[PDB]
Amino acid sequence: MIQRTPKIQVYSRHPAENGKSNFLNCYVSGFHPSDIEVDLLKNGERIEKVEHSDLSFSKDGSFYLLYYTEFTPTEKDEYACRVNHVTLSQPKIVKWDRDM
């Protein structure tokens, strides 16, 4: 009896170049149970095109699922992955690691 929390790994796929498209990699690993709500956002708005990989087993019971958009960073931007889950419940606004 132990509930595994989603480990946040919200990194830049492409380099964070001003006024040029960039894919987010909200790589959410180890969410038990599988019933997660990764409702990722852009500058406050909701992304009605959540592209999702596979609920894949890292080592039989740890789900490494990528939730990737393609956002257009301007300059004074602020993208964020929304990580709600049965463990967390609350709106956990992850701050995208562009400074990486």
Which residue has tokens 């180890």? Answer: 30
Report d(CA 58, CA 63) in Å as an integer. Answer: 6
Solved how?
Answer: NMR
Looking at CATH, the fold of the domain delimited by 1-100 is given as: Immunoglobulin-like (2.60.40)
Residue type, 46: R
Which residue has tokens 């170049």? Answer: 17
What backbone torsions phi and psi does residue 14 show, to the nearest 5 degrees? -80, 165
Residue 79 corresponds to which tokens in the numbers above?
Answer: 């993208």
| Spans of all domains in the chain | 1-100
Q: SS3 sequence, the chain? A: CCCCCCECCEEECCCCCCCCCEEEEEEEECCCCCCCEECCEECCEECCCCEECCCCECCCCCEEEEEECEECCCCCCCEEEEEECCCCCCCCEEECECCC
